[PDB]
């Protein structure tokens, strides 16, 4: 009775992140120059899949993204990168031994992908101004979610019902969208104030982040 | 190419047996080890054994010794599974897969067969009784497993009858609610039993609602 | 210019129900026997209908449910019933002299179909006490629409965690639903109260209804 | 059977003329006169006048004479509305109508032209210029009506362009802005030309961006 202890029980991984598994043996494994180490990927309501057999041998139609390890008693399956497709609990198990013994599983939960937006502001174009009105722009690039909570503040000063904003459709591959707001004024109301801003809030950004620009 | 099929999901009464087929396909049969593996709900992998179909030689993990019996039959590219004295703890889905042998290996597996043991329980049929249009019942309480169907004066009565969905209690049985509304002038005259049917346990209960003394 | 004054402006009906508009007209149309009064149905972004010409000669293949009226200056069309596919304005127009005028319209809107639940309270069946267990059983019958807040209140106590609860997929004709609440107790739980009742709150009553029994 | 036919939504200029088609079909048509209606978005019918297709014979409402014009073609089974000196006041669905005579009725209806009179107008483009990867773009602002095209230095430059959707603004003109990400060193070598392509007014706008001196 080989006890396989996996390590961890559970982790969370993003898409694009390396993940490492590892199975822990309470006796070596190591029997005529190789290890009878083998893993199984089980996806929910499906039956287990074989990714790699004797600590090293990748399986037939299992991408390289999954690699094998080790001996003696330290296993190691990698995932590298990390995709969608890999929510599933993995299993180490040997036989070196009869009985044929199963780690206890390692729950691998892809984590929801969160792109915070590249926020840009932009100045009226002197060819505008010359025109009488100044149009302020604030770009939200590339954000996931859609929620996003953003705010022109002029002078330390909550404008309202001045902006208009538009969005991109959902981005195909990265599902991610844009915002443009564009803050409109008088060429009277834009020589009035200073230091034209943008308060941008987002899951992705750690504190909210505020683009600013200075001679209005 | 290479398929294991197995049966699809089992209901079987406690202290009975199961025999489980594996249809092997697209592959020798006879030249590789077939391994069997349990796995109860959202909990892990536990090895019964395997079994050489050359030889029909096979091992087993103690805590399945005299519980499973792996079979095969070389004629019919199958291999077999039966479990005995079945008791609750044997609620899981079971596998087959094809053993590669040289690192042991469970190569390709069975999509698994689901094998539930418990009791299959017609329902006790407890009448609704109006008291003032009007509305009345019968209660289809503690059965096992679904589905049951109800009929109202065997079926000649169908309008305002709503037969709810059915609700798991704690006890791990189902109960149900059939109600139909009626004139309750016609509660002094018009025999209301509603029949209920299990195909599963081959009941029919039918039961009269009469007004409360 | 004859002026034609519809009346009402907009009226909101529930199918079932008989709607009338009303055209009054600045001057007689009465000419040589009839009264040369029409109306019209214009379903939003689609051109206008004729139901009525001559103010009682319905046209081809408009429903009966639309009938005409009257003469002089006083005329009236009617739905009888009123079904959801009545939802239009309603244009009334003369044709009696130059110019052909138009009434004002009178906007139809169909109201939201609202079915209160039909409340029934169940008393558990002697042949289920001598088997050692309570269940009461509250019925709230063809509700519209689906939200509707019930409770469980046991001489005057709510009661929690005791009760569940089916819901029958939405009616295809009348869109309703019907809701069973199986409130279950032990024979001791039931001969220790006297009143079990059941409050149910839903748009379609006024007041909260609870129905009771006594005799636990 | 009966169908009246009327041309599609028809954009035109102030100070201008559209004639307005009405195919008549399944019915003698040269038997029943046609009545022409004016429609303003979400308010009522306004009798504009009908033509007798037999004498072409016209009766027009006062506000309207000088206005429309209702011509027939007995040949091609079609009524016509020219409408003149067209103003803002003269957007509305126009709808012709078969008239049954005998209660003046307009029996069958016309789907309706929708006819919109105000100025197509090309986009000003400002440049959104960068100072610090960074973005930069091109605001478009001021056009009717859409849809207006954005390429980047002539449709060489694809990656990191997000032109965004048109927003109505109270002027009643459009506004979107295309916006780049790039590398902030290419800032100093590349040149970033926005292109502006808007069929309606058979404008091609280019701009330059370049940071702020």
């Known amino acids: 009775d080989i006890v396989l202890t996996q390590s961890p029980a559970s982790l969370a991984v993003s898409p694009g992140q390396r993940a490492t598994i590892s199975c822990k043996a309470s006796?070596?494994?190591?029997?005529?120059?190789?290890?009878?180490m083998n893993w199984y990927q089980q996806k929910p309501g499906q039956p287990p899949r074989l990714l790699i057999s004797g600590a090293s041998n990748l399986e037939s139609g299992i991408p390289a993204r999954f690699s094998g390890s080790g001996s003696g008693t330290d296993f190691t399956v990698n995932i590298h990168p990390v995709e969608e497709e890999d929510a599933a609990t993995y299993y180490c198990?040997?036989?070196?031994?009869?009985?044929?013994?199963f780690g206890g599983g390692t729950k691998l939960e892809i984590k929801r992908t969160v792109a915070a937006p590249s926020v840009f502001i932009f100045p009226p174009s002197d060819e505008q101004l010359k025109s009488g009105t100044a149009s302020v722009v604030c770009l939200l690039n590339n954000f996931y979610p859609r929620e996003a909570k953003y705010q022109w503040k002029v002078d330390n000063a909550l404008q309202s019902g001045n902006s208009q904003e538009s969005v991109t459709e959902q981005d195909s591959k990265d599902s991610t969208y844009s915002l443009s707001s564009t803050l409109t004024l008088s060429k009277a109301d834009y020589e009035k104030h200073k230091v034209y801003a943008c308060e941008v809030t987002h899951q992705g950004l750690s504190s909210p982040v505020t683009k600013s620009f200075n001679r209005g | 190419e290479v398929l294991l099929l197995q049966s699809g999901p089992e209901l079987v009464k406690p202290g009975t047996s199961v025999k489980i087929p594996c249809k092997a396909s697209?592959?020798?049969?006879?030249?590789?080890?077939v391994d069997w593996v349990k796995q109860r709900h959202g909990k892990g992998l536990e090895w019964i054994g395997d079994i050489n179909p050359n030889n029909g030689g096979t091992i087993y993990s103690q805590k399945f010794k005299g519980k499973a019996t792996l079979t095969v039959d070389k004629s019919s590219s199958t291999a077999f599974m039966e479990l005995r004295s079945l008791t609750s703890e044997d609620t899981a889905v079971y596998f087959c897969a094809r053993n590669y042998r040289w690192f042991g290996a469970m190569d390709h597996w069975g999509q698994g067969t689901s094998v539930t043991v418990s009791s299959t329980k017609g329902p006790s049929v407890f009448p609704l009784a109006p008291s003032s249009t009007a509305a009345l019942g019968c209660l289809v309480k503690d059965y096992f497993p679904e589905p049951v169907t109800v009929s109202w004066n065997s079926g000649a009565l169908t309008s305002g009858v709503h037969t709810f969905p059915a609700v798991l209690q704690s006890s791990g049985l189902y109960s149900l609610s059939s109600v139909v509304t009626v004139p309750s002038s016609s509660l002094g005259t018009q025999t209301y039993i509603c029949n209920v049917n299990h195909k599963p346990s081959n009941t029919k209960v039918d039961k009269r609602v009469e007004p409360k003394s | 210019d004859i002026v034609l004054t519809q009346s009402p402006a907009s009226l909101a009906v529930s199918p079932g129900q008989r709607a009338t508009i009303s055209c009054?007209?600045?001057?007689?149309?009465?000419?040589?026997?009839?009264?040369?009064?029409?109306?019209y149905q214009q379903k939003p972004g689609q051109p206008p209908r004729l139901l009525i010409s001559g103010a009682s000669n319905l046209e081809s293949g408009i429903p009966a449910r639309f009938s005409g009226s009257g003469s002089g200056t006083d005329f009236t069309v009617n739905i009888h019933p009123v079904e959801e596919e009545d939802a239009a304005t309603?244009?009334?127009?003369?044709?009696?002299?130059?110019?052909?005028?138009?009434?004002?319209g009178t906007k139809l809107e169909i109201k939201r179909t609202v079915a209160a639940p039909s409340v029934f309270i169940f008393p558990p069946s002697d042949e289920q006490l001598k088997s050692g267990t309570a269940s009461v059983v509250c019925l709230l019958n063809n509700f519209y629409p689906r939200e509707a807040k019930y409770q469980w209140k046991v001489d005057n106590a709510l009661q929690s965690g005791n009760s569940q609860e089916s819901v029958t997929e939405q009616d295809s004709k009348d869109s309703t639903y019907s809701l069973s609440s199986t409130l279950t107790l032990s024979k001791a739980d039931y001969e220790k109260h006297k009143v079990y009742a059941c409050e149910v709150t839903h748009q379609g009553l006024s007041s909260p209804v609870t129905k009771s029994f006594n005799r636990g | 059977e009966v169908l009246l036919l009327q041309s599609g939504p028809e954009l035109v200029k102030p100070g201008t003329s559209v004639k307005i088609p009405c195919?008549?079909?399944?019915?003698?048509?040269?038997?029943?006169?046609?009545?022409?209606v004016k429609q303003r978005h979400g308010k009522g019918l306004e009798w504009i006048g009908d033509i007798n297709p037999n004498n072409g014979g016209t009766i027009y409402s006062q506000k309207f004479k000088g206005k429309a014009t209702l011509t027939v073609d007995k040949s091609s089974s079609t009524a016509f509305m020219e409408l003149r000196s067209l103003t803002s006041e003269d957007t509305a669905v126009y709808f012709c109508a078969r008239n049954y005579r005998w209660f003046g009725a307009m029996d069958h209806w016309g789907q309706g032209t929708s006819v919109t009179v105000s100025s197509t107008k090309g986009p000003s483009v400002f440049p959104l210029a960068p100072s610090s990867t960074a973005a930069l773009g091109c605001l478009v602002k001021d056009y009717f009506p859409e849809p207006v095209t954005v390429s980047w230095n002539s449709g060489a430059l694809t990656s990191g362009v997000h032109t965004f959707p048109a927003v109505l603004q109270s002027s009643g003109l459009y506004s979107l802005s295309s916006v780049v990400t790039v590398p902030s060193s290419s800032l100093g070598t590349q040149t970033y030309i926005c292109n502006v392509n808007h069929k309606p007014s058979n404008t091609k706008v280019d701009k330059r961006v370049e940071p702020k001196s």
């Open positions: 697209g592959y020798t049969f006879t030249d590789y080890n």
């Open positions: 006796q070596s494994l190591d029997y005529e120059g190789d290890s009878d």
């Open positions: 198990q040997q036989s070196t031994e009869d009985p044929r013994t």
